[PDB]
Ligand binder design. Structure first.
Ligand SMILES: Nc1ncnc2c1ncn2[C@@H]1O[C@H](COP(=O)(O)OP(=O)(O)O)[C@@H](O)[C@H]1O
Ligand SMILES: Nc1ncnc2c1ncn2[C@@H]1O[C@H](COP(=O)(O)OP(=O)(O)O)[C@@H](O)[C@H]1O
Ligand code: SF4
Ligand code: SF4
Lengths: 593, 357
């Protein structure tokens, strides 16, 4: 048997006809060579267009494109009949949708730019599906999804007796769009009559006094979680709420979102941290494809199986490979943990601004290792990191030595005129051009494809990857990253992990990665700094300690114990009040790698 | 085809058709203003009463038909030429009618009254009478004789019929130094013919040990030109032993496919890697037309369907010019792993020696 359609997508935001000669396409194109119309020129909007009705799918044009603004795929003709939306020819296409459901929490996992957000607009009444045809009605949608639960969704959606509220993929829009306080706002947006429960469970009663612009990450995020629920809506769609929440927060916010299911309200969630995902969801979707060419949502799965299958890279329900190797993790017995040479040591420091107090106990820094920083936000993880960084001078003690520090700040904002390549190039041209930084850093984080746009003209997730890469291409003794986790997806999060681990181990250098995402910690960490006290008041930084002994020490203050999943190997969070929860906590070992 | 030219003026030729391409040759020569005589059969229609009833008939023998249209038909493999009769037997008086006929296998005479051109006589002789080849090189080596044949569609002949004059084991042990001598001779004669005819395998077959015995000796003597042993069926020798080896032995057809297929994909890989090199790839009617005139094309790879396209003339010329320049031109099935990419590439791909812009 056989059957096959060709599908061409050109990321125009990457095409530039004047730089590659004169549309390198039509020139290099074999079909056009022999008097054909595979690639046509839009001599007006000045773009190239591939008439899929021709294109043999030989892929010559793809290899030639000086950038990589072309993708040509040969489909078996099947998924093509389940086609949802095309943004015009040579443009992004969606196949299938996530199946939302009442009274249940429908999970989503899968890398950015695969039209997670495309589906949200579709469901929000603000975009009619064309079903990759020409449609501008609901009725063909309702038919196409006949045999499935989403027909019923589009019928209600059109009567307009449901409207979903959406927590946007980037936040930090509400501070520059909505002025005055968190106190104020939360009265205004109120319509659900559940004001009391929300503000208390998400612990924003201290956070009312400050204005939006004065918030820290964890707080701003949570205040959006609050204001979305106080708007009246049955359907709540959270895109990336894991941004900037700490370990303590993200587990507690998960409980808050889960309590919605019991109230019988429909939650749809994107999460990129498997422990948090396991815990919330009841259905799970995998989304596969290469970003910006196509995305296809898989069939709904039961959370556990769905996650297993994501890790394997092979779908047994759909028969699709989408990653040619497996997601994997590092215990502590899959390493050599041997002692190394002391780089520097720091005595007792104590910094008091007079609006937070920190005491740092005496500690050793070793060379060649990767230290993870853990604790809840405002516990002065950041105050410590900034004392070595030079932006803050210790009140007492010394950390500011003849180590050079490379500093990735907590927020990201751009102030740089010129391209991604200008910005990096002036730091160390040399590094950019070597094969290691190309295998480990630049190439898998997409930066080769990003050199053409300005820094200001990059979006949050691309720009994050760009900041991270920048900080590690600085020439330093010791590398300081404050919270790189924010706006990274699962695959990205992992890629940054393998890059940090390799680069630091090879040149035997120190890095501090302030961390809160379970998986990155699980792979990268050699040693740990657990923070305690009461946040927003006092923090006590306890000296560096082993990875296991640290996650043990800390997990016991969160009530939440972690196992090792037996299906394919991942961090398994155990429900507070379970067999494993009870066995770990009784036996003083609160964690396994 | 097989040609016999029976008259020095081409007033009598005797021609045949065995293969699809032979007919295309026969088409290409035959025009308006020829008469072909042949040897068909055209029937009558008779008789009848006072009025009209049922009844028909048939007859046999040759004839000639004038050329009035020249038409070429698929799923039939037959070139029809229609129009008026002018030669028949008269014993019944059956003249006074037209009569279509088809040029096929068996005798077909061609003549042209204003008299043929150089191009016409040349076209005929272009297809080679003896054998154009396909492999067409089979051996059978048994205790009593060594045999070795050239079996083409155009005719069929055991090339060597030399005798061992010896047993396998029956006269004594027969592991003579006149057996060692014999085998060396056998190998030599086969080696010289195989190269000369330019088809590169032979199938050895035989009884008992003997077939194997010989392959072992060939490999041990010199590195081969490609040799395979197949068991096949043998339990006779002479014309019918060679004939029996060929009949159940789709070995011939299957091997000839695998060898052509090999050549395309070897070249295919090369084109991939050359495309990276600046100015040494040609591809794309204009580019290829441009190297071929400047005489710098090493290899021309074209799927056979493009030869039978809608533009056919250009393709042949590009090949003709390259072959004259001592490139090699490759004509290959589109079923193949390499052939399917020459469709995609568009049709023409060529490897250059040196840059043509
Ligand atoms: N309005 C748009 N016009 C053109 N392309 C878009 C648009 N919105 C998103 N895309 C492209 O669609 C792809 C997937 O989009 P998105 O839904 O934002 O992905 P995800 O949520 O997985 O990050 C990306 O490559 C993105 O650039
Ligand atoms: N210059 C300052 N003056 C007064 N308070 C400050 C100053 N800088 C930071 N703070 C306060 O210190 C507390 C902790 O700060 P920080 O170390 O940035 O926390 P985190 O753990 O979230 O990184 C916050 O309550 C913050 O408002
Ligand atoms: S798609 Fe690539 S090669 Fe074609 S015009 Fe755009 S930039 Fe040039
Ligand atoms: S894939 Fe091949 S055939 Fe299709 S547009 Fe590109 S070069 Fe032309």
């Amino acid at each position: 048997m056989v059957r096959k359609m060709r599908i061409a997508v050109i990321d125009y935001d990457k095409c530039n006809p004047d730089k590659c000669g004169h549309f390198l396409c039509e020139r290099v194109c074999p079909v056009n060579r022999m008097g054909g119309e595979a690639i046509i020129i839009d001599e007006e909007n000045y773009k190239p267009i591939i008439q899929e009705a021709s294109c043999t799918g030989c892929g010559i044009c793809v290899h030639k494109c000086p950038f990589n603004a072309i993708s040509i795929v040969n489909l078996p003709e099947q998924l093509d009949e389940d086609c949802v939306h095309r943004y015009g020819v040579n443009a992004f296409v969606l196949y299938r949708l996530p199946i939302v459901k009442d009274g249940m929490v429908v999970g989503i996992v899968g890398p950015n730019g695969t039209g997670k957000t495309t589906a949200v607009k579709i469901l929000a009444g603000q975009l009619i599906p064309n079903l990759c045809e020409d449609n501008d009605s609901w009725d063909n949608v309702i038919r196409a999804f006949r045999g499935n639960e989403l027909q019923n969704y589009f019928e209600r959606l059109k009567n307009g007796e449901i409207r979903p509220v959406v927590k946007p993929q980037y936040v930090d829009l509400l501070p520059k769009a909505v002025k005055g306080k968190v106190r104020e706002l939360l009265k205004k947006v109120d319509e659900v009559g559940k004001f009391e429960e929300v503000v208390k469970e998400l612990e924003l009663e201290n956070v009312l006094d400050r204005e939006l612009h004065q918030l820290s990450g964890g707080e701003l995020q949570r205040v959006a979680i609050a204001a979305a629920l106080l708007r009246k809506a049955h359907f709540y769609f959270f895109d990336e709420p894991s941004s900037y929440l700490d370990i303590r927060q993200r587990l507690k916010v998960a409980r808050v979102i889960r309590r919605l299911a019991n109230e019988g309200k429909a939650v749809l969630v994107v999460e990129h941290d498997l422990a948090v995902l396991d815990y919330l969801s009841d259905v799970i979707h995998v989304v596969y494809g290469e970003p910006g060419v196509y995305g296809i949502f898989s069939k709904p799965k039961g959370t556990r199986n769905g996650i297993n299958e994501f890790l394997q890279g092979y779908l047994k329900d759909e028969n699709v490979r989408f990653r040619p190797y497996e997601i994997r993790f590092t215990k502590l017995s899959e390493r050599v943990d041997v002692e190394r040479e002391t780089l520097v040591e720091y005595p007792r420091l104590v910094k008091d601004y007079g609006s937070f107090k920190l005491e740092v106990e005496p500690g050793e820094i070793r060379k060649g290792e990767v230290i993870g920083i853990v604790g809840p936000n405002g516990i002065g993880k950041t105050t410590f990191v900034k004392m070595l960084a030079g932006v803050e001078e210790p009140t007492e003690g010394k950390v500011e030595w003849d180590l050079t520090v490379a500093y990735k700040p907590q927020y990201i904002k751009a102030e740089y005129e010129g391209t991604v390549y200008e910005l990096l190039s002036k730091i160390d041209s040399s590094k950019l051009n070597s094969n290691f930084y190309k295998t480990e850093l630049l190439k898998p984080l997409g930066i080769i494809d990003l050199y053409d746009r300005n820094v200001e003209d990059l979006s949050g997730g691309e720009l994050q990857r760009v900041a991270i890469a920048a900080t590690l291409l600085r020439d330093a003794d010791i590398y300081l990253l404050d919270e790189p986790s924010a706006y990274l997806d699962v695959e990205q999060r992992l890629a940054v992990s393998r890059a940090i681990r390799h680069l630091m181990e090879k040149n035997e250098k120190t890095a501090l990665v302030v961390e809160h995402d379970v998986l990155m910690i699980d792979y990268v960490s050699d040693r740990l700094i657990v923070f305690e006290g009461e946040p927003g008041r006092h923090g006590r930084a306890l000296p560096p300690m082993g990875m296991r002994e640290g996650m043990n020490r800390f997990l016991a203050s969160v009530g939440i114990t972690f196992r090792r999943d037996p299906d394919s190997g991942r961090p398994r969070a155990n429900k507070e009040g379970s067999v494993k929860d009870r066995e770990q906590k009784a036996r003083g070992e609160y964690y396994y790698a | 085809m097989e040609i016999l030219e029976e008259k020095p003026k081409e007033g009598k030729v005797k021609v045949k058709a065995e293969t699809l391409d032979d007919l295309w040759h026969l088409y290409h020569i035959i025009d308006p203003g020829d008469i072909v005589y042949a040897k068909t059969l055209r029937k009558q229609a008779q008789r009848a009463d006072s009025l009209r009833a049922e009844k028909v008939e048939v007859i046999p023998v040759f004839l000639g038909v004038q050329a009035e249209k020249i038409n070429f038909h698929k799923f039939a493999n037959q070139v029809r030429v229609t129009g008026p009769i002018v030669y028949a037997s008269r014993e019944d008086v059956p003249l006074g009618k037209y009569h279509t006929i088809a040029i096929e296998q068996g005798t077909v005479v061609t003549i042209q009254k204003p008299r043929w051109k150089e191009h016409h006589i040349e076209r005929l002789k272009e297809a080679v009478a003896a054998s154009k080849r396909a492999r067409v090189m089979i051996v059978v080596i048994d205790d009593g004789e060594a045999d070795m044949a050239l079996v083409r569609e155009y005719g069929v002949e055991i090339l060597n019929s030399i005798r061992h004059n010896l047993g396998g084991k029956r006269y004594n042990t027969d592991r003579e130094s006149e057996e060692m001598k014999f085998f060396h001779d056998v190998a030599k004669t086969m080696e010289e013919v195989m190269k000369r005819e330019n088809v590169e395998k032979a199938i050895v077959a035989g009884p008992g040990f003997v077939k194997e015995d010989f392959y072992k000796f060939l490999k041990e003597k010199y590195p081969e030109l490609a040799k395979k042993v197949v068991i096949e069926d043998t339990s006779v020798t002479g014309r019918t032993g060679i004939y029996e080896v060929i009949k159940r032995g789709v070995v011939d057809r299957v091997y000839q496919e695998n060898r052509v297929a090999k050549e395309v994909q070897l070249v295919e890989k090369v084109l991939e890697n050359i495309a990276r090199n600046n100015g040494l790839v040609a591809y794309g009617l204009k580019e290829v037309e441009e190297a071929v005139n400047y005489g710098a094309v090493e290899t021309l790879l074209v799927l056979d369907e493009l030869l039978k396209g809608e533009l056919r003339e250009k393709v042949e010329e590009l090949m003709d010019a390259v072959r004259y320049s001592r490139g090699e031109v490759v004509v290959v099935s589109s079923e193949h792993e390499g052939g399917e990419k020459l469709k995609a590439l568009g049709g023409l791909a060529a490897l250059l020696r040196f840059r043509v812009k």
